Amino acid sequence: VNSFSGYLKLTDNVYIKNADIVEEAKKVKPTVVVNAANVYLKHGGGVAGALNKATNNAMQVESDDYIATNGPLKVGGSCVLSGHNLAKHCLHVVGPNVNKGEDIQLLKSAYENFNQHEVLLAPLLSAGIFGADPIHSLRVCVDTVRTNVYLAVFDKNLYDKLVSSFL
């Protein structure tokens, strides 16, 4: 039993809810919240900008030190950093950004990072300002992640479309 509430069950291990991932993280304080990161961990907008703002920019300060030491992530890669006031840990995962021409096949590699964590609160990778089709992102998630994932979808219209079209 865990503390996640109000989710629709899609499969044995995937759950989905119309929610703001920031407010959901604040309320549950999950072990892991996933950030929709870019390779530079520049958390300017989208999910990343919202998560970072909620940490009062502490996520960005930590991230800048990480990049200065380690260099950029790979598209499809991830790193574990602090969850600050939102979670124990933040798993920063880089899905391909279609608006940069990145290969959508890398979306499966991105979701494979979730399998290193037993339970996660997450957005749909490569959705929103990353330009991919969220219906496709949900399909890759379900077909790749084997651990227990709780997906937060900000847009109510999109959430209803994702549920109604789910095979």
Ligand SMILES: CCc1c[nH]c2ncc(-c3c(C(=O)O)c(C)nn3C)cc12
């Ligand atoms: C609609 C207003 C809004 C405020 N904050 C948001 N955060 C994320 C998304 C969003 C998501 C998500 O993860 O829910 C996905 C997937 N695509 N898009 C575009 C939308 C908003």
